Write a protein that binds this DNA or RNA. Structure first.
Ligand SMILES: [Cl-]
Ligand SMILES: [Mg+2]
Ligand SMILES: [Mg+2]
Ligand SMILES: [Mg+2]
Length: 195
DNA sequence: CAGCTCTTTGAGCTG
């Protein structure tokens, strides 16, 4: 099996509060992209907040683009955008291959700087700890998990908490945007787990 | 149709 690190990015969801003074161009971009559900999806599109998703997807792609240059390969990932009770956030589960825990902090710090530069027009998001690596315990090492984390924690999310998900892991391709498939994989996970 | 372009990163689109 492969192993994964997790980075949680709190995605700006109120431009006036999080990106004070940002140019109108940012607003035009985020409000102008139209999203459509693939036919395999069984999600209710009306529950998806498009401007926030547009930002999350841009963050995701910039993140993975930079990550791959660090890892030197097309790293495996499962990313899920969620609308939490306090924050909209991206759960970025990325394979550890080619990235040591010792250097992970620095690499993530560089990606954060790139996000600020190429996504937020040089404006630092006014959200505390908006880019955080999941640790073993508060004040510990970087947490490493296996794919079992996906059906245990990510898959069971439903709308409106679940906003969208992406993955290059074949086992979870249908699950990304299909509730019925997520339910099937979670049920299988619980069955095996109870034993 | 071979590149140029865009909150890209590669493939749709145009000179
Ligand atoms: Cl939250
Ligand atoms: Mg290379
Ligand atoms: Mg969450
Ligand atoms: Mg493209």
């Amino acid at each position: 099996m492969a192993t994964f690190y997790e980075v949680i990015v709190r995605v700006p969801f109120d431009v006036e509060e999080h990106l004070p003074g940002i140019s109108d161009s940012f607003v035009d971009w985020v409000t102008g992209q139209i999203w459509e559900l693939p036919p395999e999806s069984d999600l209710n599109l009306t529950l998806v907040e498009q401007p926030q998703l547009t930002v999350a997807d841009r963050i995701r792609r910039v993140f993975l683009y930079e990550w791959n240059k660090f890892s030197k390969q097309e790293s495996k990932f499962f990313v899920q955008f969620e609308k939490g009770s306090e924050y909209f956030h991206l759960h970025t589960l990325v394979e550890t291959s080619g990235i040591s825990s010792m250097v992970l902090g620095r690499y993530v710090s560089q990606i954060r700087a790139q996000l600020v530069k190429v996504v937020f027009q040089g404006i630092e998001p006014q959200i505390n700890d908006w880019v955080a690596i999941t640790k073993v315990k508060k004040g510990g090492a970087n947490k490493v998990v296996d794919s079992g984390y996906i059906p245990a924690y990510l898959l069971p999310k439903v709308q409106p908490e679940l906003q969208w998900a992406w993955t290059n892991l074949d086992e979870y391709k249908l699950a990304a945007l299909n509730l019925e498939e997520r339910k099937r994989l979670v049920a299988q996970f619980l069955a095996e787990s109870s034993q």
